[PDB]
């Protein structure tokens, strides 16, 4: 593939997010690195405008699937890396069951040798006392399967999956994700056969950090073929 060679080593990552949820404007910056050979990501995020108005876990999916590990026999299906370095646009609507929804738009591409994910997020119709604005979510994260299928007319892919966020009372808050990725360049991209990415993430805190933040370690590997 084209961009495949761009991910052979450890690649630095820079994340920029501007958000507005129910009238509360905020920004998050993140830095770290990704090692696609092992499907590994290590990143630290900071809310640069003060306290984050929504729970950090709700932003995980939004805050670079080109770092997923694709087994050798599945390389022909790696759309994400095939779109580099010009990049792809990734859009989503995230529906929080019995609550609001996030609508996001991001561009992920290389700037020099840094992989950048620049995102705009708008959150609407959230209940002021629901699990999100009420900060009722536990600070942890579950493993999920992310389903990918080709969208040939759009020369891109459609992705869909459900995230299960543990709530403090033992219950669960579901977040249905609908995603569309399209290439930024005019060049060719690899359009995949159906498959999924198996994801696991662990959230932690930097004991020395006084700003509102989240440390994230994540492993993602492709499967299903």
From Swiss-Prot:
Effect recorded for residue 199 to I: Suppresses the 475 nm excitation peak, leaving only the shorter wavelength peak at 399 nm. In H9; increases fluorescence at 395 nm excitation
- What does the annotation give as the result of altering residue 45 to L? In mut3.3; shifts fluorescence lifetime from 3.03 to 1.88 ns. In R10-3; matures to the red-emitting state with excitation and emission maxima at 555 and 585 nm, respectively
State how changing residue 218 to G affects the protein, per the record: Suppresses the 399 nm excitation peak, leaving only the longer wavelength peak at 475 nm
Entry's transmembrane regions: none
Describe the effect of residue 189 to A.
In mut1.5; shifts fluorescence lifetime from 3.03 to 2.72 ns
Q: What is the effect of changing residue 151 to V?
A: In EBFP2.0; shifts the excitation and emission spectra to shorter wavelengths and increases quantum yields compared to BFP
User: What happens on changing residue 65 to H?
Assistant: In P4; leads to no detectable fluorescence. In mut2.2; shifts fluorescence lifetime from 3.03 to 1.94 ns. In mut3.3; shifts fluorescence lifetime from 3.03 to 1.88 ns
Q: What is the effect of changing residue 95 to S?
A: In alphaGFP/cycle 3 GFP; improves folding at 37 degrees Celsius, reduces aggregation at high concentrations, and increases the diffusibility of the protein inside cells
Outcome following mutation: residue 141 to H: In mut1.3; shifts fluorescence lifetime from 3.03 to 2.78 ns. In mut1.5; shifts fluorescence lifetime from 3.03 to 2.72 ns. In mut1.27; shifts fluorescence lifetime from 3.03 to 2.85 ns
Mutagenesis or variant effect for residue 146 to I: In Azurite; shifts the excitation and emission spectra to shorter wavelengths and increases quantum yields compared to BFP
- Please describe the quaternary structure of this protein: Monomer.
The molecule here is called Green fluorescent protein
Q: What species is given as this protein's source?
A: Aequorea victoria (Water jellyfish)
* Gene of this entry: GFP
């Amino acid at each position: 593939s084209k961009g495949e060679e761009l991910f052979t080593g450890v690649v630095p990552i820079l994340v920029e997010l501007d958000g507005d949820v129910n009238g509360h404007k905020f920004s998050v910056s993140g830095e770290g690195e990704g090692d696609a050979t092992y499907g590994k990501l290590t990143l630290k995020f900071i809310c640069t405008t003060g306290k984050l108005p929504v729970p950090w876990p709700t932003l995980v999916t939004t805050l670079v699937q080109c770092f997923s590990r694709y087994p050798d026999h599945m390389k022909q299906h790696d759309f994400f890396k095939s779109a580099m370095p010009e990049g792809y646009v990734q859009e989503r609507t995230i529906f929080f069951k019995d609550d609001g929804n996030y609508k996001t738009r991001a561009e992920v591409k290389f700037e020099g040798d840094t992989l950048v994910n620049r995102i705009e997020l708008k959150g609407i119709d959230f209940k002021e006392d629901g699990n999100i604005l009420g900060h009722k979510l536990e600070y942890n994260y579950n493993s999920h399967n992310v389903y990918i299928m080709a969208d040939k007319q759009k020369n891109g892919i459609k992705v869909n999956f459900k995230i299960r966020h543990n709530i403090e009372d033992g219950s669960v808050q579901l977040a249905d994700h609908y995603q569309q990725n399209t290439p930024i360049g005019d060049g060719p991209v690899l359009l995949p056969d159906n498959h999924y990415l198996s994801t696991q993430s662990a959230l932690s805190k930097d004991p020395n950090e006084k700003r509102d933040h989240m440390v994230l370690l994540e492993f993602v590997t492709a499967a299903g073929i």
